[PDB]
C-alpha cells in the first residue's frame, strides 16, 4: 500500500518468472535429473506463491483479472512440467530396460557359443560356426552403438538408423536359427531379449516425443505469462 | 519517463540472451543455435551502446560503461564455449574415423587368416582372439558414447579405464600373435589415436563447463548493474 509498492511487487513477480524459465532450461541441460527437477519445482512454486499473494493484495478489477489469468496459465504450466518429468522418468526406465535386455542377449549368446563349440566335431565346421556367432555378436554391439548415438543426439536420423539396424539384427537372428538348428531354443532366448530391447528403444523414442511436446507447451505458456506480467507492470508504471 | 523505457528494453534483452545461451547448450552447441545466441548478444550489446550515447548522467553513463565491460567478458566467454563445442565436435568425428580404422584393420586381418590354408584349429584359435579384441573395442565405444550422452566423471573415468584395458590387452596380443605385428600395429595405432580423441573430448567438455560458469557469473553481474540503472530511474 506504500506509494510505488505494487510496481515493486510486480518486479518481484517478473524476477520469479525469469528464475523459473532459467531453472527449466537448466533441468533439460541436466538431462532431467532429480536434483534439477527439484530445483525447477521450487522455482515454479515460488512464482505460484507470488501470484497467489498478489491475488490478495491488488484491488482493481483489471489487475485481479490479470492475476487470475496468470494463475490459469500457471496451472497449465504445472501440468506441462509434470508431463516433462514423467517423460524423463520414462526415458530413464527405457534406458534401464535396454541395458538389462542387452545383458540377457549377451549371456544367451555366451551359452549358445559354449554349447556349440564344446560338442565334439570337425574343426572345419566349428570354425564356420564361430564366424556366424561372431558375426551376430558384433552386429548387436554395433546396434547398441547406434542406439547410444541416438540417446546422445535425439535426431530423427539417429532414431531411424538405430531402428533399421535393430530390425536387420532381428531378421539375421531368425536366419541364424536356420543355420544353427540345434540351438533353436537358445536362439529364441536371444531373439526374445533383442525383441525386448527394441520395445525399450521404442518406449525411449515415445518419451522423447512427450518431453519435446511438453517443452513446446511451456514455451508457449511462458510467452503468455510474460505478456500478462508486462500488462500488469504497465498498469503500475503508468 | 522514456529512459525507464530504454532500460526495460535492455533488461528484456538480457533475459533473451540468457534464454538463448541456455537453448544453445540444450542444442548441444549447434551452429544454428550458436547463430541465435550471437544474435541475442549483439542486440543486448547494441542496446548498451545506444544508451551510452543517450543517458547524460555521470552516474548512469558509468553504470552503462561497467555494463559494457561485463558484456565484453561475456562475448569472450561465449567465444570460449563455441570453441569448446567445435572441439567436442572435431573429437567425435575423430573417434568415429579412428574406430572404423581399427575395425577395418581387424576385419582384413581376419580375412587374412580365413584366406590361409593353415590348420583349422590354428585358424580358429587366431579368429577367436581377433574377434574378442574387435568386440572389446565395440564395448569401449559403447562406454564412450555413454559418456558423450551424460558427461559425468563416473562415465568419463569408466570409459578411460576400459579403454586403457583394451590397449593393454592389445599390446599383449601383439606378442601372442607375432605372425602379425603389422596388422595388429595398425589396430593399436588407431586405438591409440581414438584414446587421444576421447581425451580431447574430455578437455573440451571441461572448457565448455568453465565458460558456462563464467557467463553465469557475468549474467548476475549484468543484472546488478541493470537493476541499479533501473532503480535510479524509478526516482
Curated annotation (Swiss-Prot), chain B:
Q: Where in the cell is it found?
A: Cell membrane
Periplasmic compartment spans:
4-235
Q: What does this protein do?
A: Chemotactic-signal transducers respond to changes in the concentration of attractants and repellents in the environment, transduce a signal from the outside to the inside of the cell, and facilitate sensory adaptation through the variation of the level of methylation. McpS is a specific chemoreceptor for 6 tricarboxylic acid (TCA) cycle intermediates (succinate, fumarate, malate, oxaloacetate, citrate and isocitrate), butyrate and acetate. Malate, succinate, fumarate and oxaloacetate cause the strongest chemotactic response.
Which span of the entire protein is present here? Answer: 46 to 277 of 639
Organism of origin is Pseudomonas putida (strain ATCC 47054 / DSM 6125 / CFBP 8728 / NCIMB 11950 / KT2440)
- How is loss of this gene reflected in the phenotype of the organism? Mutant fails to respond to succinate but responds to toluene.
Q: Which residues bind (S)-malate per the record?
A: 18-23, 212, 216
Q: How does it assemble?
A: Homodimer. Exists as a mixture of monomers and dimers in solution. Ligand binding stabilizes the dimeric form.
Q: What is this protein called?
A: Methyl-accepting chemotaxis protein McpS
Modification after translation, per record: Methylated by CheR2.
Amino acid at each position: 500500500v506504500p506509494r510505488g509498492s505494487h510496481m515493486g511487487d510486480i518486479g518481484q513477480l517478473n524476477k520469479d518468472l525469469t528464475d523459473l524459465r532459467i531453472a527449466r532450461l537448466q533441468y533439460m541441460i541436466a538431462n532431467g535429473d532429480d536434483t534439477a527437477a527439484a530445483n525447477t519445482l521450487a522455482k515454479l512454486d515460488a512464482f505460484s506463491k507470488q501470484q497467489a499473494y498478489l491475488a490478495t493484495t491488488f484491488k482493481s478489477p483489471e489487475n485481479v483479472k490479470l492475476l487470475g489469468e496468470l494463475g490459469d496459465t500457471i496451472s497449465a504450466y504445472k501440468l506441462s512440467l509434470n508431463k516433462m518429468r514423467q517423460g524423463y522418468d520414462a526415458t530413464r526406465a527405457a534406458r534401464v530396460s535396454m541395458d538389462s535386455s542387452a545383458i540377457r542377449a549377451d549371456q544367451a549368446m555366451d551359452a549358445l557359443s559354449q554349447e556349440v563349440m564344446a560338442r565334439p566335431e570337425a574343426d572345419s565346421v566349428r570354425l564356420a560356426q564361430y564366424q556366424l556367432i561372431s558375426k551376430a555378436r558384433q552386429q548387436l554391439l554395433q546396434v547398441r552403438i547406434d542406439v547410444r548415438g541416438y540417446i546422445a543426439e535425439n535426431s530423427s536420423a539417429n532414431e531411424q538408423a538405430a531402428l533399421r539396424q535393430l530390425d536387420a539384427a532381428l531378421a539375421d537372428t531368425d536366419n541364424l536359427k536356420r543355420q544353427l538348428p540345434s540351438e533353436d531354443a537358445r536362439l529364441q532366448q536371444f531373439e526374445n531379449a533383442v525383441l525386448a530391447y527394441r520395445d525399450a528403444v521404442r518406449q525411449f523414442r515415445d518419451a522423447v516425443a512427450n518431453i519435446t511436446t511438453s517443452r513446446a507447451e511451456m514455451t508457449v505458456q511462458g510467452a503468455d505469462i510474460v505478456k500478462r506480467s508486462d500488462a500488469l507492470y504497465q498498469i503500475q508504471l503508468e
